[PDB]
Amino acid sequence: SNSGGEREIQRTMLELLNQLDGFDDRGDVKVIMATNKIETLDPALIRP
Amino acid sequence: SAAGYDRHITIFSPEGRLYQVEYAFKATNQTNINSLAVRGKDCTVVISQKKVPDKLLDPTTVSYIFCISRTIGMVVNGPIPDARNAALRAKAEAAEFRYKYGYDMPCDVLAKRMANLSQIYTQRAYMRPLGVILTFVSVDEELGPSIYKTDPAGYYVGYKATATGPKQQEITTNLENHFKKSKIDHINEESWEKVVEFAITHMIDALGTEFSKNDLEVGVATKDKFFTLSAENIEERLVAIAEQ
Amino acid sequence: SMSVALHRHSNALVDILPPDSDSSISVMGENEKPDVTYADVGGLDMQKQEIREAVELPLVQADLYEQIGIDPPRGVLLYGPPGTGKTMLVKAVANSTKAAFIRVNGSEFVHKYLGEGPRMVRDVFRLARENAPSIIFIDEVDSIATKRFDAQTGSDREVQRILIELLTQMDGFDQSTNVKVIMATNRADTLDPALLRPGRLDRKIEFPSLRDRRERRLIFGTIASKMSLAPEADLDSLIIRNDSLSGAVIAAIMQEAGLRAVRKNRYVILQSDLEEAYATQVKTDNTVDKFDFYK
Amino acid sequence: DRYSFSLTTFSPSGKLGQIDYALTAVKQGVTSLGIKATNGVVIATEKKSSSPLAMSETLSKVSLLTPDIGAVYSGMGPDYRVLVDKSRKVAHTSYKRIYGEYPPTKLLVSEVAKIMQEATQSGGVRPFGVSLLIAGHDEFNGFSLYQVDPSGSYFPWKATAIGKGSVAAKTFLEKRWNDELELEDAIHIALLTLKESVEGEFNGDTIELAIIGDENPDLLGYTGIPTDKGPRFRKLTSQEINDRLEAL
Amino acid sequence: LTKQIKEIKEVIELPVKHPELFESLGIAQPKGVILYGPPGTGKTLLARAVAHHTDCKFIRVSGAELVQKYIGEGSRMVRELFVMAREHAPSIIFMDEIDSIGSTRVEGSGGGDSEVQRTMLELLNQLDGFETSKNIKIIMATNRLDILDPALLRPGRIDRKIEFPPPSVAARAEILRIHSRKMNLTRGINLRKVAEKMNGCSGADVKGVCTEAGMYALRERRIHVTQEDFELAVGKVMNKNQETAISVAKLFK
Amino acid sequence: IFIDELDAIGTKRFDSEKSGDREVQRTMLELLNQLDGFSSDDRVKVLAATNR
Amino acid sequence: EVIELPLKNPEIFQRVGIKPPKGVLLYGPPGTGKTLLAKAVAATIGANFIFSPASGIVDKYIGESARIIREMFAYAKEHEPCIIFMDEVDAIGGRRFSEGTSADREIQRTLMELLTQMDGFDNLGQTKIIMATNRPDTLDPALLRPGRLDRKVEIPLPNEAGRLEIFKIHTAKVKKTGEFDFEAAVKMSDGFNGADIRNCATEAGFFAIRDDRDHINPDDLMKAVRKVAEVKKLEGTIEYQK
Amino acid sequence: EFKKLDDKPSLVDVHLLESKVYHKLRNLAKSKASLTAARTAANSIYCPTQTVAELDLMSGILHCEDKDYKTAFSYFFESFESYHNLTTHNSYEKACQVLKYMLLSKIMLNLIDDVKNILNAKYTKETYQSRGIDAMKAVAEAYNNRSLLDFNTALKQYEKELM
Amino acid sequence: RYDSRTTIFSPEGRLYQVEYALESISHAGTAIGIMASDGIVLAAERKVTSTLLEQDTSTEKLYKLNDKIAVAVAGLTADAEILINTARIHAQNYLKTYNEDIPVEILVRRLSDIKQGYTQHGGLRPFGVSFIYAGYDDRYGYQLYTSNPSGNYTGWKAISVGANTSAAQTLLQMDYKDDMKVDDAIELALKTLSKTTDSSALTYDRLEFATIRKGANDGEVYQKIFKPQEIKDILVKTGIT
């Protein structure tokens, strides 16, 4: 909430959604997201 | 600060203060007039400023001293809507009392009941404080000269002499000097005319401002009658002072 | 693990340094105290006798604590409304112990980065060991310590982290030849009463502001010292009329009296000057102005 | 909070912030106190005027509800007078219709207390601004003394105080109170305790002191009937007060 | 605090000295302890006493980790908690975080909360492990459970919760006994008196009276500590608590 | 000179993060002083706009 | 008395045997000339001037205020004699806080380190502090008792014959035929601040320049004071403060 | 017998009586002890006025021998106030002793500014006037002048007051 | 939050107002009622005590609502006051109407209905007061009940409300025997009250007490409040004093 990390989370997440979709819509490399809830993440992911 | 508080009169602060009520002690200086009520030994005088700032108004109608009943006068400082509204309650309670108990209502009992009624308006939250100071004057049928000032919260205390309005502090100081210096609690004249003259002088001293009959209005409660002096009646008084 | 010297070209260890330099300063001002008249020996000695038994005494003499067989004391808490001389009691004792007085302030430890403040705190306890016996003092704990814990922002958590670090070291896991940390606050509402806690931090001394004529006499004995006022003007007539006054109000009284002397272009202070002062820098006299419906 | 605009919902920590704030409001008021004796009750409070021109001589702060039951307050000045008005009326209703004369001390206290309860019972109405002390005498329970809190609860006490200097007056009273005290002796404790409140403004004419003591068939207002008891309440005069402050 | 001495021995020493017995007889292994209750009870010192007898590593980690940067950052020293614990096993780790951060960030979410969320959560991963358990005895300390975060609180990936009591009359007496030997033993025996007079609210109060009593003797300049010294000493500390709550019988419900 | 929104080159509040728009703010004073480089400000006049 | 004499001569206070008085709280309404009056005293001595808003050091960055006051005082020691003008102590005013949002807690930090910095510890040599504020009603008790401090100066609205002196200063600047009508003007100009009197000269001269004369006549002074009085209470609320 | 019944003002005095007994046997270690014993047990300070006047006097005598004479003075002044403003029934005798003692401590500090404050016509040359007051001031001035020859003249005639 | 009024429910259908009102009872002192074969004993605890406080004029948590049924009180006392009076009036309304005294179950049922009614309709507050009703009626002989601030009742052979509810409950039931002598009922009450209470010395002035018996003065339900001097004695038998 000060400094030293205002950028890092923002770049890192966005960059994750992008290369999952950009492969192609494959059924040969599966991903698993393990998460406490969707209330600790963004309200849209990438999104059904 | 503010977090609810001031939006209501049934909300206290951490301090227990009811803020909205304090705003009416700031709302009673909104007419910009100042009053002086003084005691003699057969009268009470009450004097307020008369502002006729546009000549589009009739200087006659202008006043804030209202006759409440035979023996009771009252000066209002603060708003014209709340002036009339407080006068309605006062006129009405004075008449009802007269007929309930068969006998006239003292300065103190009118002062007492107006405050209680106001208190109930602070207890409840469909009403609000009437933001006026009312200063009742009567010469009592049993306690002689009296002044009771009623404050917008609904405190009441008597007085020897009192001042109200924004410029109150200078008038307080003058009046302190006067009674201290005499060591008696009243003006010493037994002629009510010179007491009105004396009240006038004090008022000019305290404010620093010389007056005219267009800048005064004077109420005089004597024993068993009340009268408000007209403009030419005041005028007579001023020319006694200026050349004694 | 400590500081060390490497040579510039070899980039190899040739010499060693104290760990006492390369950190933050041991004393922010001068090591010896500024006031050498004192207003701590002159002013509240009684209250000062409590402070000294805990702080000066164990470092000067080990033999004293040994005799009972009790170990060196726990921390000292200074609290009571402002104008009680706590800033000046702590250093007046320290200088005469011949410690060298950490202070620094706990307002230093706050920082705008992350993880660096709690680091400063850990740094200070080891540092105090390296120059020990030493008197450890943090000037405020009025913001380190709190009314309510919070972490809605990350910036609340930082405060909370410094709090933790105080206590954790103020057990001591590597002992202290120091008296344990001395702390100062204004009140106990900005203290967690759960976490300070006897044990720990055990001597807790409240300074009064309400006083007694004896407490206030001392403040005048200090003033009679610095300016020995005429044998004609009566010092003791000023005392009897004081009923509820702080040592800071008293400080101003003498400042204002000898200001009127500079004005009259004299070189003495008279009993007139005291009465003028006696009226004023007292405040109040404004709660009667429109209020009387709260009585 | 979110329970301190509410006159309705309790907290999960109990009560209303509004009561708690009412207790504060009480503590902004002047120091009042009452001390119970084995043959009396003395009641004392102070008067400030906020202008030497003011005349609070006409104002009463020690006020008789019934001839046998007086009361004081600490807290808001206007709230007291109305609550008192209603006290007397409810007093005539509740036992001056049953025995046709003034109620026991116990009966009036609980009823006055009932009025406070109604201004808490209903939201949108704030509690009354004041806490009272009510001292009276009845024959079935003797001399008694009470605190009636705006909360709607009441407590009996040997001696107590309320107002700004309350916490200092409370300790004074503990020590100096004895198993047997005379009327003169509570008057003597009372003065010393009130003088803590203000000094350089302390004279017994600015201090209102009255009693609930013994019958007075002099201030009864009639005579020639010895088969009645006169008012247990009495106001002592300015000179009589002055006498006790001269004596101390 | 006898109850606590017996438990922490059964829970920590027995799986480390012999892992075979616990697996044969029961199933699984405990992942640690969550110590909670009043502060002053000497959780830490007790735990240091455990670390010494088992012949285990120590460390002790003081607070949240970000603070060390001399090489790397403190976010990754949590990752290295595994590497270090394992190589130098057998270990006990007394992981501190009192959680005066509070319940504010038990709910939270938002703020700068995500870093300390991460430090706490990822620590959790190394213990239970994804194969191999590094150490089975990482150990949590905190004042309450309501201030404790739910990943860590939730049992079965941290095991055992043990609550310290505010001390009994019996406990006070036994704490009083061990320090008074070090001091001076009162003539007539007035060690019995102290525990009757008041029971502290923590075990820090019992120790804090003992240091105070021998303070009283000292000032007078007397080697021995009397009945009298103990009598002022209990009184001075009781007075502090009594200050706090006193207006809960005047202007109260 | 017509100067657009002053809600971003010279905020009243510093609870906005600014470090170079902090330096723009200091230069806005220097401009007003320099219009007195001919006497008064008649020749080189400045108008300015803000939306709050 | 408090600032100018002991800095110029410490010596007279050594003779009186007291310590020098330090610390002034100046408070009053905006446009009452508190900057003017603070600036004026120092400028005589030749003393350096530091004007630091106390809301320009409050950022979201926690400890940002602490750091800025730390350097500020240490620079002043070199620039002795110097008076630091703490402009607004009502943006760091009050004591309670130490809870809720991080801005509330930023106030305490600024306050607590200053207390020692006044106090002489630290050590104000020929540095003196003059404190200016709008609100002494919300101020810290620690930073507003006695002995921070020697005189509490309440500066009201400009006096009935104080405004007359402000008209003298301003009416001097302009080219005029000579005007003697300020008597009525000042009476029109009740409740005004020196900022509004300043405006009145400038306005009175704009009318002269609209009428194509280079001279301020009595006709135009009268216009300035009526029109300012109107537009002052229209965009004002007539704010109440000590 | 009454430590399990200690709360009385009666035994505050009993602790004061130890200070007196141990003062005369000339050991101050155990007077200062019993002085604290009285003070702690006299946290019931709204119990009688006499007790409080003895308590201050006893403190003063000890600190006077501790050689702290500014501390000596403050308790001594306070003892004085008690007697003078309390009713007279024997308090006159006690008031006089304490006025000598005020003078006593201040002459040790060798300050004559404040000795001369104490000497006034409102209680030191009016309500109480005594030969021992005049002895004290004769010594005071003699000390300051640094003439042992002025000390010598005084002591022969005022020995009675001294002793 | 959904604690704004009684009308409004959370997602889960609980109402926070009820919850707060339970917690209100345990911020005032322990209260214990024990039923025994030979009488039902009531005992309660003083949350207040000052050194100048008196408590000899009245018990502030014990009222007889009828000459056969009496209640011990836990909660805020102003709230308590209103309801104590409502119950006692309703009791005698029964006496007027039927010329016999009210059965226990009706009396409890009436007050929980009134209390629920404040939740069901309007703006009015719920009133968090827990009464322990100890009564005798020919339906089930001695009967000991308590009323919830949730506005329903449950029968009992022992119950504790007020401070330390968990602590009081296990201790009472451990030393419960189905029978129980009225003297042992008294002895037990005092012992559980000392442990719960943070005042080390349980004195008679920290105690309120009544014992209710039809085994004493047969054919008549007789409720008797002990005086201080009787309470003072029993403490010496239990060895507290």
Ligand SMILES: Nc1ncnc2c1ncn2[C@@H]1O[C@H](COP(=O)(O)OP(=O)(O)OP(=O)(O)O)[C@@H](O)[C@H]1O
């Ligand atoms: N020990 C003392 N007793 C009496 N007066 C003192 C004492 N020490 C210093 N003083 C006087 O009191 C003045 C104000 O005290 P000081 O600033 O030391 O207070 P504090 O209680 O530490 O304050 P803060 O809460 O503002 O940190 C000093 O300027 C000095 O004149």
Ligand SMILES: Nc1ncnc2c1ncn2[C@@H]1O[C@H](COP(=O)(O)OP(=O)(O)OP(=O)(O)O)[C@@H](O)[C@H]1O
């Ligand atoms: N059971 C005991 N026997 C002896 N001493 C005890 C005992 N328990 C606590 N103490 C003493 O009480 C003091 C306070 O305990 P300590 O600071 O070690 O507590 P903690 O509860 O682990 O604290 P934190 O929450 O700050 O981590 C110490 O001086 C300790 O030695």
Ligand SMILES: Nc1ncnc2c1ncn2[C@@H]1O[C@H](COP(=O)(O)OP(=O)(O)O)[C@@H](O)[C@H]1O
């Ligand atoms: N009393 C006065 N005498 C002269 N000019 C004044 C006076 N008060 C205010 N001014 C004018 O108002 C302008 C702004 O007021 P300033 O000095 O910044 O006040 P403050 O510090 O009270 O907010 C000044 O630059 C000056 O033109």
Ligand SMILES: [Mg+2]
């Ligand atoms: Mg300080």
Ligand SMILES: [Mg+2]
């Ligand atoms: Mg620990």
Ligand SMILES: [Mg+2]
């Ligand atoms: Mg300015």
